[PDB]
């Protein structure tokens, strides 16, 4: 119906390529071949009233947009695609875009998929704490504790039993502890506190980064520097701070050097692997920072304010519990930004 519109452009585009190709052909020809013959023609020609019109219209048109102009100043998708000729076969890039078109429309015809676990959805579509069931926790593997040989008997009250040489964590208690921990994250988020998510086991970064992003919090996936909280001026003083309003938007006010050296202590610390982060837990205790952590059967519950009994070795179990806490924080943040609007 409107294809001709695009055809009109392509016509010019083809013509432009022709003009450019033969501009380069004349750039090779020696001047001795063209110049003297060209000048001789003018020596044998007489300008007419019309010819003179362009003698000065082009002089100004070239003395306005080529010489007396500002060289600088003080199709949206894939705009650099070089389409192939209508007779030539598709280019590699065009085949990729032709396949992308198929992927959006046709590639998903025939059936829909239900009741299938997709790992990424644990991070991007975590459930709300009130909708979590024992089945959901069990599906994520949260009940699978450590070997009975590695039992830290201080966890006895969290254990449901032993099965296949491991201790089974009581998910009924996990759910109650998880709900309590989730409410704490929501409260701190709704109050404007700094929430730090600490996890240093391989693969946890993706979950940790999204959790911080949706709660406007912070995360550490690589290494907890011993002294980050107790020796904060020697480790974190150099890094930049900022002032923000009740909507979490940067105020842009420059900060006095006094305000930029003061310790910035987290209001809440979430630890995915506490057995490998004793340093962080002890600093949190020394600094009076409440902490949440996943407590496996070989982990010490009393080292944290709000333990969550659960498997800490599986990325699915960790990302499931982290996702729930992250969404709880998000709801607190959304309730704080809503009360500011109204």
């Amino acid at each position: 119906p409107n294809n001709n519109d695009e055809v009109m452009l392509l016509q010019q585009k083809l013509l432009y390529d022709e003009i450019r190709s033969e501009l380069k052909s004349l750039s090779q020809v020696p001047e001795d071949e063209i110049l003297p013959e060209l000048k001789k023609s003018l020596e044998q020609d007489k300008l007419s009233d019309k010819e003179q019109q362009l003698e000065a219209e082009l002089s100004d048109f070239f003395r306005n947009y080529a010489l007396l102009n500002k060289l600088f100043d003080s199709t949206k998708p894939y705009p650099n695609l070089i389409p192939s000729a209508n007779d030539k076969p598709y280019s590699s890039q065009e085949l990729f875009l032709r396949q992308l078109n198929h992927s959006m429309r046709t590639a998903k015809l025939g059936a829909t998929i239900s009741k299938v676990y997709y790992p990424h959805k644990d991070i991007f579509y975590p459930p709300l704490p009130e909708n979590i069931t024992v089945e959901s926790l069990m599906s994520a593997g949260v009940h699978l504790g450590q070997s009975t040989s590695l039992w830290r008997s201080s966890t006895q009250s969290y254990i449901y039993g032993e099965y296949k040489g491991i201790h089974i964590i009581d998910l009924n208690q996990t759910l109650s502890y998880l709900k309590r921990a989730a409410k704490v994250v929501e409260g701190v988020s709704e109050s404007g506190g700094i929430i730090l998510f600490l996890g240093t086991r391989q693969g946890q970064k993706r979950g940790l980064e999204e959790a911080a992003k949706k709660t406007h919090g912070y995360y550490v996936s690589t290494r907890w520097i011993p002294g980050t909280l107790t020796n904060s001026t020697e480790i974190s003083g150099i890094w930049e701070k900022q002032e923000i309003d009740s909507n979490d938007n940067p105020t842009e006010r420059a900060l006095s050097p006094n305000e930029t050296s003061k310790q910035v202590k987290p209001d809440l610390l979430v630890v995915l692997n506490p057995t490998e982060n004793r340093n962080a837990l002890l600093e949190a205790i020394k600094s009076r920072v409440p902490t949440i952590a996943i407590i496996d059967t070989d982990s010490e519950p009393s080292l944290v304010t709000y333990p969550i009994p659960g498997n800490d070795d599986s990325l699915r179990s960790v990302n499931f519990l982290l996702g729930v806490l992250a969404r709880a924080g998000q709801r607190g943040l959304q309730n704080r930004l809503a009360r500011n609007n109204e």
């Binding site: 998708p77 894939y78 705009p79 650099n80 695609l81 070089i82 590699s92 890039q93 990729f96 875009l97 992308l100 404007g192 700094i194 730090l196 980064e209 911080a212 992003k213 919090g217 912070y218 995360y219 550490v220 996936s221 690589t222 290494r223 520097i225 980050t228 974190s236 890094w239 930049e240 701070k241 900022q242 002032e243 923000i244 309003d245 009740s246 105020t251 900060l255 305000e259 003061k262 910035v264 987290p266 500011n340």
Partner: protein, 231 residues
């Protein structure tokens, strides 16, 4: 309305908050455009990779905290985004990568294409030990003059004559050029090899496609060895 002071970066409590934030920004781009195919000219080894130096990245990537492996990780992601097919790239990727290109735009190059002179002669200079040689190469039939004298007169050693001929022997053009060589300083060996070096540099103008063969033969490399005062 109430205002509070918070860490600027989500990675504030990490070892290097500045490097981790920059890596996260690049990782987001590599995730958003995971599908985009990569250059097939990478097999052709395109000669474009002007990334900032480790020291320059330390200004923006944590300074002393910056570790070499962290810089290596930045380059692996900058190159991967850079190697996306040019036709299928977008502005977002290029905008992010612009900040990491070594700044060399305000300045220009100092090399002008060499060309034959008004008489069809290629002029090059060569140096060996204390000797210097200025040769004039033109298309001819294999006539050579050294300081106005016959080659056998000026150079008595056949090995010195063979050195002068070697660059022409590499391009199999011994009978295709006339050489007018002028040399001064040092002795016979320094002058003969200085002429050899100068002929090789003068032959590249006649056919720049043979430079790689001349470099491989070793005639375009200036010999650095000179008499060293004992220390």
């Amino acid at each position: 309305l109430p205002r509070r002071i918070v860490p600027k970066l989500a990675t504030f409590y990490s070892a290097n908050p500045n490097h981790e934030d920059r890596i996260n920004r690049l990782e987001r781009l590599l995730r958003k455009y995971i599908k985009l195919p990569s250059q097939n000219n990478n097999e052709a080894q395109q000669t474009k990779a002007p990334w900032i130096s480790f020291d320059e990245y330390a200004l923006i990537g944590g300074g002393t905290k910056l570790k070499p492996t962290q810089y290596t990780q930045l380059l692996y992601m900058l190159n991967k985004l850079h190697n996306i097919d040019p036709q299928l790239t977008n502005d977002e990727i290029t905008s992010e990568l612009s900040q990491y290109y070594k700044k060399s735009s305000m300045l220009s190059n100092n090399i002008k294409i060499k060309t034959l002179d008004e008489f069809g002669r290629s002029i090059a200079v060569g140096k060996r030990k204390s000797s210097t040689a200025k040769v004039f190469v033109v298309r001819g039939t294999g006539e050579i003059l050294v300081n106005g004298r016959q080659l056998n007169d000026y150079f008595l050693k056949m090995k010195d004559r063979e050195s002068i001929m070697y660059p022409l022997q590499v391009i199999e053009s011994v009978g295709k050029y006339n050489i007018f060589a002028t040399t001064s300083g040092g002795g016979p060996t320094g002058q003969a090899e200085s002429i050899m070096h100068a002929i090789a540099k003068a032959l590249v103008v006649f056919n720049p496609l043979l430079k790689s063969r001349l470099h491989k033969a070793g005639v375009l490399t200036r010999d650095y060895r000179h008499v060293e005062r004992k220390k």
